[PDB]
Amino acid sequence: LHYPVTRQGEQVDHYFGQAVADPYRWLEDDRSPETEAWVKAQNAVTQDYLAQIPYRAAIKEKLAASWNYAKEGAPFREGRYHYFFKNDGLQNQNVLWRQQEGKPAEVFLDPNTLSPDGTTALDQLSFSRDGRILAYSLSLAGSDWREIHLMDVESKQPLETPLKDVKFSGISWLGNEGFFYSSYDKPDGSELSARTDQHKVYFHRLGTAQEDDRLVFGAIPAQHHRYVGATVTEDDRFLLISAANSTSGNRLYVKDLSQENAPLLTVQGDLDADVSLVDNKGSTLYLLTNRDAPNRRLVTVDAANPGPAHWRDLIPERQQVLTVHSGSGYLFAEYMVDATARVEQFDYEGKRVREVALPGLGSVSGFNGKHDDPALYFGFENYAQPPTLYRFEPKSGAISLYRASAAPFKPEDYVSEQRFYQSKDGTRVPLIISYRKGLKLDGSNPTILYGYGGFDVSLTPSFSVSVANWLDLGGVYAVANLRGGGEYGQAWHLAGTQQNKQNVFDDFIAAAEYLKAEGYTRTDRLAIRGGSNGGLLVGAVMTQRPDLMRVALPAVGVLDMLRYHTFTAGTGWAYDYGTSADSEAMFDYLKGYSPLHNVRPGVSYPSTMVTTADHDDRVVPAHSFKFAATLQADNAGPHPQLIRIETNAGHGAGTPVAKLIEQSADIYAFTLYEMGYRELPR
Ligand SMILES: O=C[C@@H]1CCCN1C(=O)[C@@H]1CCCN1C(=O)OCc1ccccc1
CATH class of the missing domain: 3.40.50.1820 (Alpha/Beta hydrolase fold, catalytic domain)
Incomplete structure (x- = not known):
């Protein structure tokens, strides 16, 4: 030796x-x-x-x-194209394909072409509201750092120079004007070991330089946090900003986008609980939280006065851990029963529609879609069951096998x-x-x-x-x-x-x-x-x-x-x-x-x-x-x-x-x- x-x-x-x-x-x-x-x-x-x-x-x-x-992901619509990830079998990275009515499927975004050994990977992908512009983040050599690229979806050619210094970031569009993302600032020294703790939320407007992006949160002393995130609701009415210093616990803020220069209102001002946005309906925000609920609960509150003392249960806490996904005008409550999943369908008024039967005991993924999606997709798998895809008809509950595993x-x-x-x-x-x-x-x-x-x-x-x-x-x-x-x-x-x-x-x-x-x-x-x-x-x-x-x-x-x-x-x-x-x-x-x-x-x-x-x-x-x-x-x-x-x-x-x-x-x-x-x- x-x-x-x-x-x-x-x-x-x-x-x-x-x-x-x-x-x-x-x-x-x-x-x-x-x-x-x-x-x-x-x-x-x-x-x-x-x-x-x-x-x-x-x-x-x-x-x-x-x-x-061959492996294939579930399809998702954006414009006249349905998009879907596929892998011939041993492609270093999954390829994003798309297909339009009356034409054969085509390769849309193939990460494999970006690196010799496929070490460059696609992380986030976010289409503009109208689906004409795509912002997506890439990772180089497996690092947590990122670059956000902007592509004109129609021609598949670069729109702008990529945004740099992005990290632990979402990409959330405000209509078709641009999007919010998070960034730190290149530290002095190795960006692969040096400490970074002042995360910031920026808004990149299309047709402008990154040096001109407005700083939305995290710059003044009172807003200094190690982790900040930003999400604009599907209907473009509310911007939700989260701020945290650890991996557990976060402050949450909301800005009414339907008004000119609205101030940030505090949904939660302490780090004593996790709280995250699920969706809104009118001026009501739907939040998943563990505040006063160890196994978590879904609460609602009017965005004009969002403080915790005002939250009201929509899906009360149960003995099992709750996680919530929304799609097609329904809320899907996933519960953990001794590490395995169970799903229940609820409407936005908290009324239970039905209990969705799963293929067996394992993990589910999916049940995430826009308000308007006519069908939702979910995956099921476990230690001895390769990933299987199913299509769910929300109104009737009809479930059909979409992709059996190969x-x-x-x-x-x-x-x-x-x-x-x-x-x-x-x-x-x-x-x-x-x-x-x-x-x-x-x-x-x-x-x-x-x-x-x-x-x-x-x-x-x-x-x-x-x-x-x-x-x-x-x-x-x-x-x-x-x-x-x-x-x-x-x-x-x-x-x-x-x-x-x-x-x-x-x-x-x-x-x-x-x-x-x-x-x-x-x-x-x-x-x-x-x-x-x-x-x-x-x-x-x-x-x-x-x-x-x-x-x-x-x-x-x-x-x-x-x-x-x-x-x-x-x-x-x-x-x-x-x-x-x-x-x-x-x-x-x-x-x-x-x-x-x-x-x-x-x-x-x-x-x-x-x-x-x-x-x-x-x-x-x-x-x-x-x-x-x-x-x-x-x-x-x-x-x-x-x-x-x-x-x-x-x-x-x-x-x-x-x-x-x-x-x-x-x-x-x-x-x-x-x-x-x-x-x-x-
Ligand atoms: O290569 C196979 C090894 C030997 C047996 C389990 N293995 C695994 O790789 C298992 C299954 C997938 C996650 N995994 C794992 O070890 O993850 C480690 C990890 C966890 C969290 C962040 C980074 C890395």
Whole structure:
């Protein structure tokens, strides 16, 4: 093996009188020659280790082959054209097609033509009210930064020069005059690591330069927020601006566009609850909120006096988490029943029309359309059921199959069961276990336990070609709905935030134990996977309980819990993690589980494959660099401690299919090989 030598510096930070050594501090410099050479050496050693796995190629071959099938999205009208995304099978990026009556479908926007390896991706797309102008945002090399392009839809040629410095932004048109978007300002230093916290809302008027765009919110001191958004209602009557400093909680403002220079009225002036616009009807706004409702509710209020004390329930809170979509003149309430979906159709007066029956137990998507759409589309899927499209007739409730999946996976071939286990403190936690029919609970099944746990994020049934290939190889895939998540409302989330964070790691640990106790797998056949916050999860569990698994796979994880907040928009996660500068108690708690600071010399850690990317500006790469250098430094047993740095890729969204395939191939090969397999399972 032999890892690349990683020099240790003399950096020492102090937190409330406590001194902490950070020898790999130089690795935080993403622009230095030393770091670049380091990444290269590391990738080199990883590829050389992987090259030793005989069936690596067979696995990649299998993945690419099963991934290679036609995929198509649901159609949407704009002018005399219906638009729709498609993928011939292995196109690095989905292509947007369009078709008009009496003519063959045509390619409209093909992202693949923008980059050699398809690393440029299309994020947001917003047509002008009349559908003649299209504004759409592109991501370069997987970064959170964006450029908004403007195309004349008819000729498909550029209208104006692209807007720059956009980030975490929507695109919401005010009729056909122009649109609102959000921007920060290029920071001095690397735009892939330097802190940004004064998000701003701008209005770009068509036929003007970007330097002349009016600043709508975020410039004066009283409006300084880390995250701002803007949405103009479908009927162009109200502008809704949201402002937040963290990923949970936001202020909300409304401006009556039907009047000349109307002032901003406060819908919510504190950060004590999340509140978002769904739609309006006349002067009434329809808002989804968790204020005084842990599982959320839909309320209405007259926009001329929108304060929270004036909100009135339209869809009262229930025992299950509520999310609302609108379309065709109806509100569609989606509820979460133990991580699976249920849908109810309501009219704008809060009267329940009917309960919409779904294909099975899994996740639904869709039920989003304009007031005037005569039909709505929804998707259904789960761990063993590839994405299926349905067309919904709103008035009668008629449902018909729009697109059956072309994936080479028979759903009847698998089992995806839900179990509930208990954590250290007694809490009952849900676990969905998927695998190919005919498995035997003899504790020998190669298993991958997946978890996230935080940020009110819910892990609902989701289909993946990678996971389906793992099930085919005979593996088990288990997803735990850990606290910290949003599965059971705000309380579930908060039971996993700040100084309660350890509850999340305890739930994951207890899930691992349940899987062995129930006979699905055993320690040397167990791997744990997690990304971002789920990366912290893997990092925390492997350092606290290195005896628990055989393989650990932390992806783009937050590993230095003491400095995380000093990068990009990490501070935006203070609500969930708290920071080392909050108080000595918070510092101590963070230091107490921070993965980077809990790796210890002499400990035998599992075989690990830390994965990250050179353009991840959500979670700077330095987190994984330092974690990996420390493991290579401190590990004592025989297990490899490797890191795989993806090139020209970011946090995740928009990654080319070719890269996703290579990634999974590397991870599945490494995992089975580290579990001792010399030939593919069977
Ligand atoms: O390549 C396959 C691996 C091994 C088993 C599960 N895998 C996965 O990639 C799973 C399924 C899709 C999301 N996922 C995942 O790990 O996401 C990590 C992530 C989460 C959040 C932000 C960025 C990255």
